[PDB]
Write a protein that binds this ligand. Structure first.
Ligand SMILES: CC(C)(C)OC(=O)N(CCOCCO)c1ccn2ncc(-c3ccc(C(=O)O)c(O)c3)c2n1
Length: 331
């Protein structure tokens, strides 16, 4: 069978916590009063929830209400417990309340309101500095959650709220997040296709915080190269092919060998033989102003097959890409 794996960092953070911290199945949900909120306008629907701007009638405060679509008690408890454990951490969305929505008979999560600009409009306006700055802000949230024993498992533009005017960022949507326990075999059916790590695509279950760093690298590539998505697969199998056309097949097969991974037989014909491509292949007149040696070196060190080889959040924050931003924030 496959060779086991452990996180390089924060390996045993949960092992030393009280059981209650990570044992979300045991959590008893603390309900507030649904009548404290009035819905104002619908912001969007997902597979898992519908989101509204709302108002707390008592405090006259703007809030956001996420009405949960029906999922197992355990899934709701996991998201609640994680949000509560992380509350107040850097750039983590603040869970203000949990209420019972009367019509749905489902829970509703009540969050702080972020004055977000839709990424589809914002990302084109972002300068070189802006990308560095917001990447650093995401890394603060990821280092925090990782240090707290939690994997996000769904890092993507949709889940990063940016109030541009205030240079304010929040990481949202902890509905897929999980506690890291060394040796645990996780569900590979997580995250969004274009951002899935190689570990997920080859069905390597003993993954860790490093998954988030692959997803982040996918985001960085899409931003600096003006290419959304960066890895555009048609399906889950083709997704690995798209990655292999860039990172090359030699390193892919090296990863599979190192972990003794059993490759799905579907994969063989389509995978072929591909060189590792130079990042400069993706540079053009429209994106060159965003691309530096620094940016490419950093990206190279996130987008690695071998989860153990990728930069940590904490390592990434020390990269030369960020020297200007670190200086400007100690102003
Ligand atoms: C869609 C569009 C980009 C037009 O709208 C927006 O910009 N949207 C909704 C995001 O849609 C998501 C559903 O599809 C705004 C707007 C303001 N705020 N303030 C806080 C949030 C917020 C906070 C927490 C969660 C959570 O999931 O835990 C959450 O989903 C959202 C927010 N979301």
């Amino acid at each position: 069978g496959p060779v086991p794996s452990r996180a390089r960092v924060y390996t045993d953070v949960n092992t030393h916590r009280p059981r209650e911290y990570w044992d979300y199945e045991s959590h008893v949900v603390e309900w507030g009063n649904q009548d404290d909120y009035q819905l104002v306008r619908k912001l969007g629907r997902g597979k898992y929830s519908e989101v509204f701007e709302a108002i707390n009638i008592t405090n006259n405060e703007k809030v956001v209400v996420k009405i949960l679509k029906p999922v197992k008690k355990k899934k709701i408890k996991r998201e609640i417990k994680i949000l509560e454990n992380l509350r107040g951490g850097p750039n983590i969305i603040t869970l203000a309340d949990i209420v019972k929505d009367p019509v749905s008979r489902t829970p509703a999560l009540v969050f702080e309101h972020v004055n977000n600009t839709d990424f589809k409009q914002l990302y084109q306006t972002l300068t070189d500095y802006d990308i560095r700055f917001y990447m650093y802000e995401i890394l603060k949230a990821l280092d925090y959650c990782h240090s707290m024993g939690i994997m996000h498992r769904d890092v993507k533009p949709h889940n990063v709220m940016i109030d541009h005017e205030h240079r304010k960022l929040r990481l949202i949507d902890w509905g897929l997040a999980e506690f890291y326990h060394p040796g645990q075999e996780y569900n590979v059916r997580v995250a969004s296709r274009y951002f899935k790590g190689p570990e997920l695509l080859v069905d390597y279950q003993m993954y860790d915080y490093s998954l988030d760093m692959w997803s982040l690298g996918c985001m960085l590539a899409s931003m600096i190269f003006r290419k959304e998505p960066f890895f555009h697969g048609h399906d889950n199998y083709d997704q690995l092919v798209r990655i292999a056309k860039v990172l090359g097949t030699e390193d892919l097969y090296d990863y599979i060998d190192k972990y003794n991974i059993e490759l799905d037989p579907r994969f063989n014909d389509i995978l072929g033989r591909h060189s590792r491509k130079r990042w400069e292949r993706f540079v053009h007149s429209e994106n060159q102003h965003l691309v530096s040696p620094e940016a490419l070196d950093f990206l190279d060190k996130l987008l690695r097959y071998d989860h153990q080889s990728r930069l940590t959040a904490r390592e990434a924050m020390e990269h030369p890409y960020f020297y200007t931003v670190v200086k400007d924030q100690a102003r």
